[PDB]
Design a protein around this ligand. Structure first.
Ligand SMILES: CC(C)[C@H](C(=O)Nc1ccc(C(=O)NO)cc1)c1ccccc1
Ligand SMILES: [K+]
Ligand SMILES: [K+]
Ligand SMILES: [Zn+2]
Length: 358
């Protein structure tokens, strides 16, 4: 219904895994545990089940090159040896005979929710999809990603639904450099990423993940990086960043759709992220994004590798999508010194482009 929260999940999302590393963190259990907890918590039944669809070539070509799409399509017929040889041409990816099919459904799941939200058939929605997308680039896989789910969804919203301005909020612990690159010169898609950085020590080790990368050309000012340079950030660090930096800019930008790269590798317990964000924080962060774009908010799963922590973070976000009052958080909400240093530096780099920051 018009006030409902959509949810997309298909079994195909479990039908690929790393053939040569049984301990690989990006695994089918990521999504099945999310679905099991959504059901256990009674949240799944409160959502509107939305069918997935496979992305089309023309939709992929909004972001990706024809040669790359064709190469990825050809992986469905490769032997394990051929898949490994190709995967090793990229940074931090594996391949599997079912990867391409699942990746196409992963993109399409987001597009389905964009359709329902933009036409007011639903208020908001969440795709419980893998593979993730935010590292994928125009002509290459990267960081467990084949196709850039949210970058495609943003250009799709603009082409099909005629949206003028899209905000992408990326709270995964990693920098979505793929999204940054795709929209580098584009003022119609504002990209905000908060991520572990540690002066480049943390993957993907890019100079352009620092706050000095503000976009270029017509896009100058429309790329905002908030790099953390110490581990152990908590809910108060994220909430403060949203209150001091993201919300003022978002209201000035006046987006017509908000897409969230909803990774949960910053949650306490993640084996890679190094952060200490409570899952309940994501109820608050989700709530803080519902006040722009008429609440037209679509979350899509990115990273998050502790099965329980990621499922808890998804559930906390879903409670806010469904309109349940936010929980009290035990901490005061005050940030640590390192977080404040990062927030202040990002504001210093972005102030020449946002009246709300001056
Ligand atoms: C070697 C290490 C640097 C690498 C790695 O951590 N990659 C990586 C990339 C993206 C995300 C993510 O969640 N992005 O949003 C998470 C992890 C890796 C590769 C294979 C098996 C384990 C670890
Ligand atoms: K991020
Ligand atoms: K941009
Ligand atoms: Zn991540």
């Amino acid at each position: 219904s018009a006030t409902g929260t959509g949810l997309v999940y298909v079994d195909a999302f479990t039908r690929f895994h790393c053939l040569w590393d049984a301990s690989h963190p990006e695994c089918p259990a990521r999504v099945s545990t999310v679905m099991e907890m959504l059901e256990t918590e009674g949240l799944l039944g409160r959502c509107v089940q939305v069918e997935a669809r496979a992305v089309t070539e023309d939709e992929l070509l909004l972001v990706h090159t024809k040669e790359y799409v064709e190469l990825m399509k050809s992986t469905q017929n490769m032997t394990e040896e051929e898949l490994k040889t190709l995967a090793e041409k990229y940074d931090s990816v594996y391949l599997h005979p079912g990867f391409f099919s699942s990746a196409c459904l992963s993109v399409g799941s987001v597009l389905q929710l964009v359709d329902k939200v933009m036409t007011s058939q639903l208020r908001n929605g969440f795709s419980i999809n893998r593979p993730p997308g935010h590292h994928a680039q125009a002509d290459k896989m990267n960081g467990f990603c084949m196709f850039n789910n949210l970058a495609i969804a943003a250009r799709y919203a603009q082409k099909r639904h005629r949206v003028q301005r899209v905000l992408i909020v990326d709270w995964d612990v990693h920098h979505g450099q793929g999204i940054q690159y795709i929209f580098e010169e584009d003022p119609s898609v504002l990209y905000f990423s908060v991520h572990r950085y540690e002066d480049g020590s943390f993957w993907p080790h890019l100079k352009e993940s620092d706050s000095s990368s503000v976009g270029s050309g017509a896009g100058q000012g429309y790329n905002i990086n908030l790099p953390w340079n110490k581990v152990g950030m908590e809910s108060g660090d994220y909430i403060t960043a949203f209150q001091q930096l993201l919300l003022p800019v978002a209201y000035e930008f006046q987006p017509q759709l908000v897409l969230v790269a909803a990774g949960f590798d910053a949650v306490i317990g993640d084996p890679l992220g190094g952060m200490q964000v409570s899952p309940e924080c994501f109820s608050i962060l989700t709530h803080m994004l519902k006040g722009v774009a008429q609440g037209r908010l679509v979350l899509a799963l990115e990273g998050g590798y502790n099965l329980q922590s990621t499922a808890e973070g998804v559930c906390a976000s879903m409670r806010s999508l469904l309109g349940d009052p936010c929980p009290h958080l035990p901490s005061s909400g005050a940030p640590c010194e390192s977080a404040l240093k990062s927030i202040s530096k990002t504001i210093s780099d972005l102030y020449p482009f946002w009246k709300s920051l001056q």
